[model samples]
Target: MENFQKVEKIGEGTYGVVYKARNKLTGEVVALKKIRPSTAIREISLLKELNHPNIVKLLDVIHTENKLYLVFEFLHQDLKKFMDASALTGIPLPLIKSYLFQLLQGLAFCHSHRVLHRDLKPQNLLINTEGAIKLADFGLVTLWYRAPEILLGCKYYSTAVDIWSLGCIFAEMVTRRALFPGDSEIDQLFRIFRTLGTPDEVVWPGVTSMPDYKPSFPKWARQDFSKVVPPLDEDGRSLLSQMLHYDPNKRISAKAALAHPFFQDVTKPVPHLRL
Candidate 1:
């Protein structure tokens, strides 16, 4: 705590304000996140548990009588910032590949540890000065929810939730707009079904039993995947389709996705650092 000096308010995090702080002792920079003491102790603990190179580092934490502080290694920009600052076509393919690979590696690690990073959008991915992407923000993460009967939290979700977010990120990166910008949760499911076909008892067997699961909307007319994202290469398009599958059971796991044919050409060991 002595090393860091708060310079300015940077932005809002999932839980608190992130400040641009400088380490006075070593002249290093860091993002200091300040949160209130609450039920999120488990979330902060989870952040400390993750140690993947592709994930953001939780450098230190300071707990006070009422406030809690989290310090992270300094990162210059995030994926959303980069995307907003330039035209989609202007962003280099190598850069996209580099970011995507790192993202997948980070997600694969979380899956292996049975963690589901509930939130996985471009905004939560930070890029350092070296152009390396690292996954950030673990407050919403939880152990993989694999059971259909047992439910946790106010939301009924799973690891596949991250895949859904990732697919939206990929689509947004390609076209400077949200692929499925639904105003509500009901519309969100409908938007997905419109493109990838609606889920039924066959694909998602126990879905109808969920307390919030409602099929009131008229069955979405089936549509073609190719028609939606025509700009991507075959491999890129294939990866999107798999990630956005209607059924969580059919959804491509992070590990399997990383090993897909799309990544075969990338021989580098550090999947996140290289394009």
Candidate 2:
């Protein structure tokens, strides 16, 4: 009420508006997110329980008579904004590796805490002035980046969903555009199947048994990442292939992804905050 001053709108989505603000007493800059009553409880609860450098911190919560506000450490921009500024030239390879590594780092922490992000895309990732990436906006589920299992009408799934999204985001980072841009759930899965090749019983057991499974789909050869992701070396491509696997069970876990050789040179225990 009297402790913070709203600065400017930093973000807006289906949920609510986010503003850059400052604490009047402590003079600390923060992001004040005004959330809908529907999602405020779950998002705040999970955020309060999770803490890591790569994940946005939930500093505090303010409960007004009619609304709820979430206080977060202010960040400069999101990955989408960063990509747009690059002008389609694509981000540098080193920076790409760094960003993806930090993303996995945050994801590993969340998975370890047993929280599934449900929705993960460039816009949900915030970057600070120091270039550190922080995963944000948990619990908001969307279809565009949803995993194959979910699209096939499987009600039960896990962290594998987020890894698939990571693969999509990683590809977008390299190409400076969404790898599988689609207008609907079916279209989205079709795009993924086209790029990754249609799933078969051999590659993805039980896939055809799902409720929404269709008997026929156009077959495509496994795509070469070299073409779509120009900056990726063999090791990077190898890791991405596992993340985007047709079988959710086969997708690489975030903890294991952090150990992949593609990150050998840039590996750090914590996110490399400084550019």
Candidate 3:
């Protein structure tokens, strides 16, 4: 607190406000996140240990009874910012494809080590001008990108939830809008079913036993991806399908996602700040 100079406020959310600050001694800029007590310390431990090129780097930490301050290597913008501009100008295909790969690469690393990134949204992902992606805000999950299993009142969920979010974000990248912009839990389920088809226990084992599941739900077959995601290639559609599957157990893991045919032409991703 004494050595760091607050440059400007950058962002804020459920956790707390984020500020851009300069280290007085080192002269390097960083994101200073002010955490509210509504959050947990155990959550910070995961961030402390998670190290990957695509995940946001936690630089330092400080605390008080009412506050916790976290320092992270700063990036210029979030994915939503990119989508904001790219929606009009359009993000290049290869770059967009590589973005997914980078996400998968980092996600896979987390999963292999048994870490779960519960929250994932466009804004939770930071992208520098050099085409590098750094995942931020790892507290908990969110709507629009939430998995179908969770909407149905899942008791014990696994890392598949993260894959589902990545699936939604993947569609969002192509469409430049949230794939399932559900207003409520029921609305979310409807929007999800409308796109992926209403599932029975057949598609999702024990779905009928899910607490919020209702028999009155409408039946719909899976919609074609070509039209919904017009710009996505055939291989991408295949990968997206598995990622957005109804059953949490059946959903594609981040590790297998990297091997999907969609990434065939794309090179393995790495942070691109190299000079």
Candidate 4:
């Protein structure tokens, strides 16, 4: 009874309830963004226009408050957050719907807006109050999964940047980990270089001239992207490779990404569960 300042119900299950309580002793309200069914929230995007902004690496989850604060930034329980919260590898061949489609739905809107969904990936693609995947967070396409154009410092940008992130995300959905995980700028690009091989100027023309270009960068022959991601079939692999294309000019556009065979299959209907 010591810490009991107040608690207004944010949510309730049959037995327990979430709250927006304030403490009088030494603190303020506390609401956990736990990646479990207990959570009653999902702060979808509210500040922006239609959709999409990206280039991974600008923000790192690392919180604050005021009088009755309700900043969307403090919230967690997102796709990547939820993935980490869950204890196991999350997918098997039987599913495809809830996750993939809306990313594209939002992406389609993004294309219509000509905005880059740069801060994409599972982290920003959060769940809504209704159990829908809504792409939230307005920031850079986190470096871990975004295309290399930024790392190499290209002045011109395009929709292709986001498709690269989508490609990165697709591989993780297959492998349960990012195709290119975390590190510094050059370090992150090194993994891309190691995996996709160094960009040949012949292919990525003007890459050597980019301001961030490191002459000491090593050369590597491209490895089998087919050898990397799972759910292995040319159909899925083809889409990923295309998204990761070295040439921004040739990289898959959001429109093309939607039409790919990877998104081609139907989400089979399931009945109201009684099984």
> Each candidate's lDDT (Cα)?
0.70, 0.83, 0.83, 0.59
Which window of 10 residues has the lowest lDDT sum in candidate 3?
A: 266-275
- Give the TM-score of each candidate: 0.85, 0.90, 0.92, 0.68
In the range 28-84, model 4's lDDT, one tens digit per residue, is: 444322112112112222222332322111121112231112222222245665555
In Å, residue 186's CA in model 1 sits off its true spot by: 2.3
lDDT of 2 by residue, 1-275 (tens): 57989988988867768989999999999988887665757767767878899999888888888778889887878888888887456577788888899999999999998888888888889987666898987864246678899889999889999999999898888777788887898898898887778888989999889999898777778776577777668888899988988888878999999899998988333223332
Q: Tens digit of lDDT per residue, candidate 1, span 42-105?
A: 6777778889889988988788777888888777787777777755344555566666777888
Model 2 Cα displacement at 271 (Å)? 13
After superposition of all CA atoms, the RMSD between model 3 and the true structure is 2.9
| Model 1: worst 10 consecutive residues (lDDT sum) | 143-152
lDDT of 2 at 74: 76
* Candidate 3 TM-score, C-alpha based: 0.92
Weakest 10 consecutive residues of candidate 2 by summed lDDT: 266-275
Which lDDT value does model 1 have at 89? 48
Score residue 116 of candidate 3 by CA lDDT: 79
- Total clashes for model 3: 1
Scored by TM-score, the top model is 3
Off by over 4 Å in 3: 37-39, 140-142, 268-275
